[PDB]
Amino acid sequence: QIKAGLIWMNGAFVPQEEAKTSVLSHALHYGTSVFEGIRAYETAKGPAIFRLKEHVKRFYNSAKVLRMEIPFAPEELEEAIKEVVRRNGYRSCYIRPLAWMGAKALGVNPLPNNPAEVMVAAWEWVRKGARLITSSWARFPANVMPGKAKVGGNYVNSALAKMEAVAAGADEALLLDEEGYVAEGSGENLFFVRDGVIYALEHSVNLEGITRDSVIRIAKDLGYEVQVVRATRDQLYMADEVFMTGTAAEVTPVSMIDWRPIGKGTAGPVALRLREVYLEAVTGRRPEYEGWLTYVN
Amino acid sequence: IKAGLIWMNGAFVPQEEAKTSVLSHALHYGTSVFEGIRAYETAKGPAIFRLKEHVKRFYNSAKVLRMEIPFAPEELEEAIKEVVRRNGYRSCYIRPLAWMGAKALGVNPLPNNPAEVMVAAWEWKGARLITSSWARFPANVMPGKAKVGGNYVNSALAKMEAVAAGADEALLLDEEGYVAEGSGENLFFVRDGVIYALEHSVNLEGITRDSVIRIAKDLGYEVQVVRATRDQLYMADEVFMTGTAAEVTPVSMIDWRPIGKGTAGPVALRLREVYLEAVTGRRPEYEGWLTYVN
Amino acid sequence: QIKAGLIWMNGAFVPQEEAKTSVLSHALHYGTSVFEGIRAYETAKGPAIFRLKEHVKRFYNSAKVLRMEIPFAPEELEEAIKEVVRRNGYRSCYIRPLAWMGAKALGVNPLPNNPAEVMVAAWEWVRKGARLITSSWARFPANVMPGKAKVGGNYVNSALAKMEAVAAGADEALLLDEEGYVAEGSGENLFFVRDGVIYALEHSVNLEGITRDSVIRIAKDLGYEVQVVRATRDQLYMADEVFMTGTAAEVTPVSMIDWRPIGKGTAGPVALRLREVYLEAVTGRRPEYEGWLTYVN
Amino acid sequence: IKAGLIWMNGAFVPQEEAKTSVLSHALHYGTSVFEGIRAYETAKGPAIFRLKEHVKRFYNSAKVLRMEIPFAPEELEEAIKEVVRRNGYRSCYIRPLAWMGAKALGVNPLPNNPAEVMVAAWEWKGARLITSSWARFPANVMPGKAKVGGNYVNSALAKMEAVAAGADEALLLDEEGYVAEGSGENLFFVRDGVIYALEHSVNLEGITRDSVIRIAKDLGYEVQVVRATRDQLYMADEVFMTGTAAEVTPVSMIDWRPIGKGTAGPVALRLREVYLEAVTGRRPEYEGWLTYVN
Amino acid sequence: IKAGLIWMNGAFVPQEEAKTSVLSHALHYGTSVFEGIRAYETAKGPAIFRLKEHVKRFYNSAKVLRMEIPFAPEELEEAIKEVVRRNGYRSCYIRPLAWMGAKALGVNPLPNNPAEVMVAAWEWGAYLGEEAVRKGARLITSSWARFPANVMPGKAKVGGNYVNSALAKMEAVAAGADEALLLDEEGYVAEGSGENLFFVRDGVIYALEHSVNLEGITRDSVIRIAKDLGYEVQVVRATRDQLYMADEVFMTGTAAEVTPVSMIDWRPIGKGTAGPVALRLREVYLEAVTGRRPEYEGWLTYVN
Amino acid sequence: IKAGLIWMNGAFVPQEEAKTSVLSHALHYGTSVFEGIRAYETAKGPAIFRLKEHVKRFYNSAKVLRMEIPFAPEELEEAIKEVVRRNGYRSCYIRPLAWMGAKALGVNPLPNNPAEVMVAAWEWGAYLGEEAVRKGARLITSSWARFPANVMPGKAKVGGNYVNSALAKMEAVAAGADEALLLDEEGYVAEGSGENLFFVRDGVIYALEHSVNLEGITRDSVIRIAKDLGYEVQVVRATRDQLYMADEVFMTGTAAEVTPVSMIDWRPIGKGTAGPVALRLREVYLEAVTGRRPEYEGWLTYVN
Ligand SMILES: *Cc1c(COP(=O)(O)O)cnc(C)c1O
Ligand SMILES: *Cc1c(COP(=O)(O)O)cnc(C)c1O
Ligand SMILES: *Cc1c(COP(=O)(O)O)cnc(C)c1O
Ligand SMILES: *Cc1c(COP(=O)(O)O)cnc(C)c1O
Ligand SMILES: *Cc1c(COP(=O)(O)O)cnc(C)c1O
Ligand SMILES: *Cc1c(COP(=O)(O)O)cnc(C)c1O
Ligand SMILES: CC(C)CCC(=O)O
Ligand SMILES: CC(C)CCC(=O)O
Ligand SMILES: CC(C)CCC(=O)O
Ligand SMILES: CC(C)CCC(=O)O
Ligand SMILES: CC(C)CCC(=O)O
Ligand SMILES: CC(C)CCC(=O)O
């Protein structure tokens, strides 16, 4: 099982064993929950949470999409997130805030169930490159599921694609949109490099990644030209490099897609430089990016 | 919810004890499957409607997610009969649920198998619809033939929109623009004496829809299955929807445009009444669809 | 100009010259009108209007799509339609009822303009086959324009396709839907015949033609098997026959599509038989179909 | 409508005489083109805003329908100035219209050329939007870059739906599910200090949109052009729309979800005010956009 | 390929001489049409299955490309019978091909008419045994969608179309499956890389609508056989999950005959092995093509 | 076609010997890849335009099909230079082609690797004069949509892809136009049957986004030239009516060079004849490919 330890449950910390909810909870039946993925990294000055405010802002934004009411002020959630790290003595960990519709009723409409229940849990936490396979499941259109939010139900699509990719022998899935263009990974944003230029994929139906945002800023600071474009699978096949970004995935080089090697078939220099600066940033070794860190101690 | 005793992975427990970890995969990623089953009071006690058909779909939904249900269908069927008996229910709604637990939180749910399972139950002018701005998911985006938890975010968004607009229910179109179904009901319309059931397209294959078609044919109605547009519904003599919870519900208006006379029509009302007679054990011809708990 | 003569204008007949409306009429700016196409044919017992009630029903149905209020009872319109034939001494003519939003205001919302203005005008009115060309304009999706109604604005799509077809040297345009399947002509429903079976195209985004309905009934009465299906352009290219139906088009055989001959390259026997029975029906020579006729005298 | 003297194919006539045959092609098939132009009162009299740009689009719209306008642009420009002068208007809305007449009623409009033309004019918290169930037409279905009469059946359906639902305006998506525009307004949103104008996609290339972008850049704002989804708007700090009739209108709520603070935002209000200063002749930098009638 | 004597635009020549210019339009632009026909040995000699239906489709495919075949259908039919006789074949696969030649290489193929035509045939190296048939084929849904009806002519066997089939088949094999299941652009099931699909549920046999698929002659044959056996057959549009929950799934094609499908996307179909309906249909189909069914003799053309 | 000596998998042979089996996978299934390269005569001998960029795309196209080209890029580059020299050509069109051979005819082409390769070249019969260029090309929007990105590989020059181009070109010519303008399935402008599109409005040059189109080398060259001349260039998605109202429209391609478009769907573009921007870009492009522009010499590979 997950070694989470003390979990913040609607205002107070309780042992993991006591962090449970009714099986009649609306979210367990209809996917009506929202969550975030946040990381803390150890630094010379103790644990530092990466871009906490941006993650909390998105958490509340996701709730708004479902017209879900979070009965806590953003500042309270931010304090709870800092405390879940402190109270458990974590240094490098993954933090998972979750807001879900409770068991007041089970009609499909979740409004009668407001306000949402909320909890925050956490647990302690390249050159070869990842191998991807294009999925037979398309990322949902923008008027089918809210792709800019981390809504629980959305991940049935990610789960189906990820299972398919792993079953096929790949590390991750690459999903296309319904029109046939590249969208993103089951849980990562995509980038590719061609003739020295870095191409970030347009937001289309993808989540607006905070890691993606961070990597674009880093890339420009390093002097690279960055263009935002729509891309096809074969534009990726012919790229010099391809890489993915995400809180859990950090910056991961992609060496092969659909059994077709990308460039030299191993992680490229651009993706590796971006990954290195990103890791230096999250560990408090880049003064120019200290604004992105929230020190727990 | 007044559920009372709930069957939890093999044994009944008080409602307050029917809880699961907040780290359960399904609570974060919508990886659960469920069913909606009804029991109606008859002269011979409570009767569950088309129990085996619902249980079959439950396991079918699980297969779509490659979810393993650690119980034989026969065991779940017994649990469903028992949730009615042990709680002393007569007319009730039964909700079986299988969900991925808290073994891990990677998006891939396979490491979380087998699924946890529970069965709960609780005693149990025409509708006005508005076409939704949310389209029912394409067949390669979400599994529309299964009752997978995550699917219902789409239904929830559409239902909230309809209610906020002043309607009773939402009518969702598919991405191409054709009529799909309600947030939780299959659709039918009637024109010049003929009953038109909508093709399955991206919709759930409703058991009530199936029941209604059989009843309609038995009553002598001509039934055709077609793809339909919103304006084919606007000009229909009648429109109605079906579902376990919705039974057979007449639709009197869509997008503020009256359907036919603007009130519940004769065909929808007749099908609803005959359906009620079937589920309450008044029609010998349909007794095969009933499972008497006593 | 059109030789219409006496035109029924909101309750009373007036000379064609007096049948005018403000240039500030909502329908002249935003396509907010509905119309019908009805024909009267000369018979041994005088002029007979074909399926009048079905056409009037559709007229009111089209108005409902626009939430347009027609300030006359269907029976009044039916009488006006009979009178436009009588008063002008017509025998074989085309009848055009039209309801349009007036000049009360020019906001895009037409509701403030209700009730609609209404008028009814009329004017006196194969083996080679028609040549069609597939259009570069797609028939509108069912959630873009109301394709089951004869709404004025809809015909911008038909006009663009028809102009294109004529410019290319064809007689009529064949429109596909956005997905690439055959839809219908700019103003006609489509049918094809293969191995003795008659295939009527599904309604999809097309208008539910009354001529199409009539031809299907006639076909079945003649003993032909009729199937309703979705079709692709190449299914038509390989058909034994292809034909179109419409009030103005009656039953018209199609001998060529996209410069590819259909079957023998001339009208086929099936389309010709259906056309003949249809013409016998509308001229009062088929006792079994007399229910479809409304004799003006 | 209090239009007064209307220019009809070359000469002004009383409003009551400005009529056309009910057998006019455009009244049956939507084959007309129009423009929306405004005149604002300035210290130097009425000034028409971006007259030549609007006249150019008028002729461009006609080309899409292969419609022949039997007058030179210069003649129409003079007619537009005169409809303001002869009626003694100061702040007014000007509506030029070209339509296919009554020569014939075959669907093909070519036999009806040249088009008839008229020019009429009349004195002239944040908006709440709801996403429409009607999608703006694909680029190969209706000519979305032209103000063709028939196109507005789509706008009318969406607007009626929005108003019936309790909103002020409709937000239409394209068939693929992305945001397109309002029933008669282009859309913008603001996030983290950056102004985002939506790409042209299937929308009309608004002159107000163009004006707003120029003003925003001149004021020092960063402006990006992107494709957007409904939930990108839900999470924006601000959303606003532009159009000749709508000027610059802030949007405080979409689908009952508040945008930012739930009230008109600073950027939208500032752009609206500077735009008003430009059209009323208070900003020398934008005088090139004005045509003084006197 | 051991084809032997090949019919080349009117006359048979040794395989070594059956070559065409590398400047042929079809080698650069996919402008060819072909057919897949089979001759099955019987006690009365080889019998070609539904020859006229295949030849009709061959000419229909050519019409889609506005390709002119400079031979009458009867001439091609005789050549098809002769390729079997002249090579002394019993059972064999027959491949007629019409392609645009090397007159020019502008994308427009009209200047290249008339098309060159050839008919070749060769023997099978091996056949699947009942054990393999019963285990059933494993399919995986492809990331490549079958082309929309206004993108490529899906009702014709046009060479270029098969780039789509090739991409899907390679993907399926690489993923460990036997065949690919392609969806259409809208997300519904279309067909395999070279087979039509069917599924069985609650006693009813469901054939998929034609949609963007090729109108298979094997599909047609199976439907006729199923109806003759007393089965109810319905034609519908289907989703991947309707197949996941079917009692049985099977595919048809000249090369594939009737092949049961036991798993799709690692999800077992029904019992996880071939079912009784597909196995029965396959048996009757094989009895028909090998001349053991008097009622279906009209479908056979005996070479001798 | 008068090609003369053709390079066939490693060595030059007379055209008559440059033939391949009619059982070649690519002749039946469109499994080939090719390039369009040009050599322009200069006072210093023939100069091949952007040779390495074309060769890179050739190998990239092969990768999409998982096709193995058994030659190093440098070998192909030498063969391309030699086909010009050995035939004594000055200006000429060069056509490299890699195709799947006749090892087997299962739809999966992997068993057929490695691919066969050839390089042929031939001279132009005629060129358009300034009069024709100024009149401009007339386009008509096609009823055939360019394939979605998950249907056919639109970034590669794969043989099968051109069935779509062939159908569109035939349709356009039959309608009386010079070329077809294809839209994508969603209704937006894609490209011509074999040319990328550009339009000019209010002084700005608009290149179309790549969408489902091929990333043209001529398109790339024109954008560089336009920027060097001082023009503002933007890349956007466009609709047919945005082109109808453009001041100018033009298309690019190796064979098409820079061709002004004066009419689309019988609607005149701007003045109804070629405009000054397209004519200027065409002139500078021609100066570049014929070695009259020192700043662009890096794009040329002199055979002598
Ligand atoms: C969370 C997530 C990402 C990555 O976003 P980050 O903010 O960089 O963590 C990408 N795609 C999906 C679908 C996600 O849920
Ligand atoms: C459960 C459900 C129905 C109704 O199906 P029944 O089997 O009749 O209860 C219809 N649509 C959806 C989306 C459903 O989930
Ligand atoms: C009127 C019309 C038809 C033909 O319908 P009928 O009822 O047979 O006259 C077909 N298509 C369109 C678009 C039409 O408007
Ligand atoms: C007229 C119009 C606009 C606004 O354009 P402006 O040039 O700014 O007046 C926006 N959308 C549509 C559909 C329009 O017709
Ligand atoms: C040839 C083919 C089939 C099978 O058709 P049969 O006539 O049964 O051989 C199925 N699908 C495709 C794409 C084909 O090319
Ligand atoms: C070859 C080609 C082009 C032109 O590209 P260039 O590199 O400029 O020759 C454009 N479109 C298609 C479809 C092509 O095949
Ligand atoms: C796809 C999501 C479950 C992963 C969030 C993260 O990157 O942390
Ligand atoms: C809306 C759905 C969750 C209701 C299921 C049922 O009809 O029982
Ligand atoms: C397309 C419509 C204008 C024609 C109606 C009719 O067939 O009479
Ligand atoms: C809704 C549109 C008709 C309004 C045009 C304008 O902004 O003037
Ligand atoms: C897909 C095709 C190449 C196969 C033809 C056949 O079944 O014989
Ligand atoms: C479309 C392609 C066949 C043309 C390549 C070229 O422009 O040379």
Short mmCIF file of C-alpha atoms in Angstrom, two decimals, chain B residues 42-290:
data_model
loop_
_atom_site.label_atom_id
_atom_site.label_comp_id
_atom_site.label_asym_id
_atom_site.label_seq_id
_atom_site.Cartn_x
_atom_site.Cartn_y
_atom_site.Cartn_z
CA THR B 42 -45.69 -7.01 -6.34
CA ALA B 43 -48.52 -9.11 -4.90
CA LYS B 44 -45.81 -11.69 -4.21
CA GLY B 45 -43.33 -9.33 -2.57
CA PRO B 46 -40.39 -7.34 -4.03
CA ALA B 47 -39.28 -8.28 -7.53
CA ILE B 48 -35.96 -7.20 -9.03
CA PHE B 49 -36.24 -6.22 -12.69
CA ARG B 50 -33.96 -8.00 -15.17
CA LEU B 51 -31.33 -8.81 -12.56
CA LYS B 52 -29.17 -11.11 -14.67
CA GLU B 53 -29.06 -8.65 -17.56
CA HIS B 54 -27.81 -5.93 -15.20
CA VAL B 55 -25.24 -8.22 -13.59
CA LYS B 56 -23.97 -9.24 -17.03
CA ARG B 57 -23.49 -5.59 -17.97
CA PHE B 58 -21.70 -4.94 -14.65
CA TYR B 59 -19.08 -7.57 -15.51
CA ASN B 60 -18.99 -6.34 -19.12
CA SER B 61 -18.23 -2.81 -17.89
CA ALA B 62 -15.43 -4.20 -15.73
CA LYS B 63 -13.88 -5.94 -18.74
CA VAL B 64 -13.66 -2.62 -20.57
CA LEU B 65 -11.34 -1.34 -17.83
CA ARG B 66 -9.57 -4.71 -17.53
CA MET B 67 -10.89 -4.62 -13.97
CA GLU B 68 -11.05 -7.91 -12.10
CA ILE B 69 -14.19 -8.52 -10.02
CA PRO B 70 -13.16 -11.06 -7.31
CA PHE B 71 -16.63 -12.61 -7.08
CA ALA B 72 -18.70 -14.91 -9.29
CA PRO B 73 -21.81 -13.38 -10.91
CA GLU B 74 -23.92 -15.79 -8.83
CA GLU B 75 -22.42 -14.34 -5.64
CA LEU B 76 -23.24 -10.76 -6.64
CA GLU B 77 -26.75 -11.81 -7.61
CA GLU B 78 -27.23 -13.28 -4.13
CA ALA B 79 -25.79 -10.13 -2.55
CA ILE B 80 -28.24 -7.99 -4.53
CA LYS B 81 -31.19 -10.12 -3.41
CA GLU B 82 -29.90 -9.93 0.17
CA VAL B 83 -29.44 -6.16 0.24
CA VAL B 84 -33.18 -5.96 -0.42
CA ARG B 85 -34.14 -8.65 2.12
CA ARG B 86 -31.86 -7.65 5.01
CA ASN B 87 -33.02 -4.04 4.82
CA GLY B 88 -36.69 -4.95 4.49
CA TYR B 89 -37.06 -3.01 1.25
CA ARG B 90 -40.01 -3.38 -1.12
CA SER B 91 -39.65 -0.71 -3.82
CA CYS B 92 -35.99 0.29 -3.96
CA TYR B 93 -33.03 1.32 -6.10
CA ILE B 94 -30.01 -1.00 -6.00
CA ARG B 95 -26.51 0.28 -6.69
CA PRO B 96 -23.70 -2.28 -7.18
CA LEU B 97 -20.25 -0.68 -7.46
CA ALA B 98 -16.79 -2.06 -8.23
CA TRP B 99 -13.84 0.28 -7.86
CA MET B 100 -10.05 0.28 -8.02
CA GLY B 101 -8.58 0.58 -4.54
CA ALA B 102 -5.63 2.22 -2.80
CA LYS B 103 -2.73 -0.11 -3.66
CA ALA B 104 -1.14 2.62 -5.81
CA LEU B 105 -1.94 5.87 -7.60
CA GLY B 106 -0.21 5.49 -10.94
CA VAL B 107 -2.72 6.21 -13.73
CA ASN B 108 -2.49 2.57 -14.87
CA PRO B 109 -5.06 0.69 -12.71
CA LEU B 110 -3.80 -2.85 -13.36
CA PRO B 111 -1.53 -2.89 -10.28
CA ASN B 112 -4.65 -2.17 -8.21
CA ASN B 113 -6.56 -5.34 -9.14
CA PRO B 114 -8.66 -6.96 -7.97
CA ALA B 115 -11.37 -4.35 -7.59
CA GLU B 116 -13.24 -3.79 -4.35
CA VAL B 117 -17.00 -4.34 -4.58
CA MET B 118 -20.07 -3.15 -2.69
CA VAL B 119 -23.83 -3.28 -3.10
CA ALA B 120 -26.10 -0.68 -1.54
CA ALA B 121 -29.81 0.02 -1.88
CA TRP B 122 -32.37 2.54 -0.68
CA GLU B 123 -36.15 2.79 -0.80
CA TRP B 124 -37.56 4.45 -3.91
CA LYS B 125 -46.97 17.11 -17.85
CA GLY B 126 -43.86 15.75 -19.54
CA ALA B 127 -40.19 16.55 -19.04
CA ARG B 128 -38.63 19.65 -20.58
CA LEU B 129 -35.25 19.14 -22.23
CA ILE B 130 -32.60 21.50 -23.52
CA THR B 131 -29.87 20.42 -25.92
CA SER B 132 -26.50 20.47 -24.18
CA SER B 133 -23.33 22.30 -25.14
CA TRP B 134 -21.46 19.17 -24.00
CA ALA B 135 -21.29 16.36 -26.57
CA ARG B 136 -21.45 12.72 -25.56
CA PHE B 137 -17.99 11.22 -25.97
CA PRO B 138 -16.85 9.59 -29.22
CA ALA B 139 -16.54 5.78 -29.10
CA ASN B 140 -12.73 6.00 -29.03
CA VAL B 141 -12.57 8.62 -26.24
CA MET B 142 -14.59 7.08 -23.38
CA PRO B 143 -16.31 3.64 -23.35
CA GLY B 144 -19.91 4.66 -23.93
CA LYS B 145 -21.28 1.11 -23.74
CA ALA B 146 -20.11 0.73 -20.15
CA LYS B 147 -21.20 2.37 -16.92
CA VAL B 148 -17.70 3.55 -16.02
CA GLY B 149 -17.55 6.16 -13.27
CA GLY B 150 -15.40 8.67 -15.15
CA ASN B 151 -17.92 8.75 -17.99
CA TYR B 152 -20.35 10.57 -15.76
CA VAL B 153 -18.39 13.79 -15.54
CA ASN B 154 -19.82 14.35 -19.05
CA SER B 155 -23.34 13.50 -17.79
CA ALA B 156 -22.90 15.71 -14.72
CA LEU B 157 -21.81 18.73 -16.76
CA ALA B 158 -24.75 18.33 -19.14
CA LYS B 159 -27.28 17.79 -16.34
CA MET B 160 -26.11 20.86 -14.39
CA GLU B 161 -26.33 22.94 -17.56
CA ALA B 162 -29.88 21.77 -18.28
CA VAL B 163 -31.09 22.44 -14.75
CA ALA B 164 -29.41 25.86 -14.65
CA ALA B 165 -31.17 26.74 -17.91
CA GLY B 166 -34.52 25.90 -16.34
CA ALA B 167 -35.05 22.45 -17.86
CA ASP B 168 -35.51 19.01 -16.27
CA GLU B 169 -32.94 17.11 -18.29
CA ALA B 170 -30.24 17.52 -20.92
CA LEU B 171 -30.28 16.18 -24.45
CA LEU B 172 -26.73 15.49 -25.62
CA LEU B 173 -25.65 15.39 -29.24
CA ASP B 174 -22.62 13.45 -30.46
CA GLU B 175 -19.58 15.34 -31.78
CA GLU B 176 -20.95 15.15 -35.33
CA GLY B 177 -24.13 16.95 -34.32
CA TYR B 178 -26.66 14.11 -34.18
CA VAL B 179 -28.83 13.32 -31.18
CA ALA B 180 -27.16 10.90 -28.78
CA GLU B 181 -29.10 10.55 -25.52
CA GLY B 182 -30.02 12.22 -22.23
CA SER B 183 -27.55 12.57 -19.36
CA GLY B 184 -28.78 9.19 -18.15
CA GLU B 185 -31.60 8.13 -20.47
CA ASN B 186 -32.02 6.65 -23.95
CA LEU B 187 -34.26 8.52 -26.40
CA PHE B 188 -37.25 7.64 -28.57
CA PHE B 189 -39.64 9.65 -30.72
CA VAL B 190 -42.93 8.93 -32.46
CA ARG B 191 -44.04 10.18 -35.87
CA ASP B 192 -47.14 9.23 -37.84
CA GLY B 193 -47.84 6.20 -35.66
CA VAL B 194 -44.33 4.74 -35.88
CA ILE B 195 -42.05 4.49 -32.86
CA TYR B 196 -38.42 5.41 -33.50
CA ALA B 197 -35.74 4.18 -31.13
CA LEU B 198 -32.36 5.83 -31.62
CA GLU B 199 -29.47 3.68 -32.80
CA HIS B 200 -26.89 2.76 -30.17
CA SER B 201 -24.22 5.09 -31.63
CA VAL B 202 -22.17 6.28 -28.62
CA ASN B 203 -24.99 5.64 -26.13
CA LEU B 204 -25.39 3.00 -23.46
CA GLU B 205 -27.44 -0.01 -24.62
CA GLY B 206 -30.29 0.55 -22.18
CA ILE B 207 -32.13 -2.36 -20.63
CA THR B 208 -35.22 -0.15 -20.24
CA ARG B 209 -34.88 0.80 -23.92
CA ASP B 210 -34.79 -2.90 -24.79
CA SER B 211 -37.78 -3.59 -22.55
CA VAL B 212 -39.77 -0.73 -24.08
CA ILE B 213 -39.08 -1.92 -27.63
CA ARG B 214 -40.28 -5.43 -26.77
CA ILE B 215 -43.40 -4.07 -25.07
CA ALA B 216 -44.12 -1.73 -27.99
CA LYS B 217 -43.83 -4.54 -30.53
CA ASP B 218 -46.01 -6.81 -28.40
CA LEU B 219 -48.66 -4.06 -28.29
CA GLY B 220 -48.66 -3.92 -32.08
CA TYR B 221 -46.57 -0.81 -32.73
CA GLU B 222 -44.14 -0.61 -35.62
CA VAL B 223 -40.67 0.13 -34.26
CA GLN B 224 -37.75 1.41 -36.32
CA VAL B 225 -34.19 2.15 -35.19
CA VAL B 226 -32.64 5.28 -36.67
CA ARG B 227 -30.09 8.07 -36.36
CA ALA B 228 -31.85 11.36 -35.57
CA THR B 229 -31.28 15.11 -35.57
CA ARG B 230 -32.61 17.64 -33.06
CA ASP B 231 -35.12 19.00 -35.57
CA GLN B 232 -36.49 15.52 -36.29
CA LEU B 233 -37.38 15.51 -32.57
CA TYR B 234 -38.83 19.04 -32.72
CA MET B 235 -41.29 17.88 -35.38
CA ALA B 236 -42.13 14.51 -33.83
CA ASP B 237 -45.62 13.77 -32.55
CA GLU B 238 -44.01 12.54 -29.33
CA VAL B 239 -40.61 12.17 -27.69
CA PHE B 240 -39.82 10.12 -24.61
CA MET B 241 -36.85 8.73 -22.72
CA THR B 242 -36.05 5.50 -20.90
CA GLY B 243 -33.79 4.37 -18.09
CA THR B 244 -33.92 2.31 -14.92
CA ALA B 245 -34.34 5.42 -12.77
CA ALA B 246 -36.33 7.31 -15.42
CA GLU B 247 -38.61 4.38 -16.30
CA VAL B 248 -40.48 5.71 -19.36
CA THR B 249 -40.67 9.50 -19.20
CA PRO B 250 -42.61 11.57 -21.77
CA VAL B 251 -40.88 14.68 -23.13
CA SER B 252 -43.23 17.59 -23.77
CA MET B 253 -40.75 20.25 -24.87
CA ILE B 254 -37.20 20.53 -26.21
CA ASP B 255 -35.32 23.82 -26.45
CA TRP B 256 -38.52 25.68 -25.55
CA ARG B 257 -40.23 24.20 -28.60
CA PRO B 258 -43.35 22.14 -27.79
CA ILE B 259 -43.37 18.54 -28.97
CA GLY B 260 -46.69 17.79 -30.62
CA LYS B 261 -49.42 19.05 -28.29
CA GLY B 262 -46.85 20.28 -25.78
CA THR B 263 -47.93 17.71 -23.18
CA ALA B 264 -47.33 14.01 -22.50
CA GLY B 265 -48.48 11.97 -25.50
CA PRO B 266 -50.58 8.76 -25.66
CA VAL B 267 -47.83 6.41 -26.83
CA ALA B 268 -45.32 7.40 -24.14
CA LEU B 269 -47.98 7.25 -21.42
CA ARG B 270 -49.18 3.83 -22.58
CA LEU B 271 -45.68 2.37 -22.75
CA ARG B 272 -44.95 3.75 -19.29
CA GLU B 273 -48.12 2.22 -17.84
CA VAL B 274 -47.61 -1.19 -19.46
CA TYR B 275 -43.98 -1.11 -18.30
CA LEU B 276 -45.18 -0.45 -14.74
CA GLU B 277 -47.60 -3.37 -15.05
CA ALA B 278 -44.74 -5.59 -16.21
CA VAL B 279 -42.35 -4.69 -13.38
CA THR B 280 -45.06 -5.09 -10.74
CA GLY B 281 -45.88 -8.61 -11.92
CA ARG B 282 -49.29 -7.99 -13.50
CA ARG B 283 -48.37 -9.33 -16.93
CA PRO B 284 -47.61 -13.08 -17.23
CA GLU B 285 -45.89 -12.54 -20.57
CA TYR B 286 -43.09 -10.61 -18.84
CA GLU B 287 -42.68 -12.67 -15.66
CA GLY B 288 -39.40 -13.96 -17.05
CA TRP B 289 -37.94 -10.50 -16.41
CA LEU B 290 -38.67 -10.69 -12.68
#
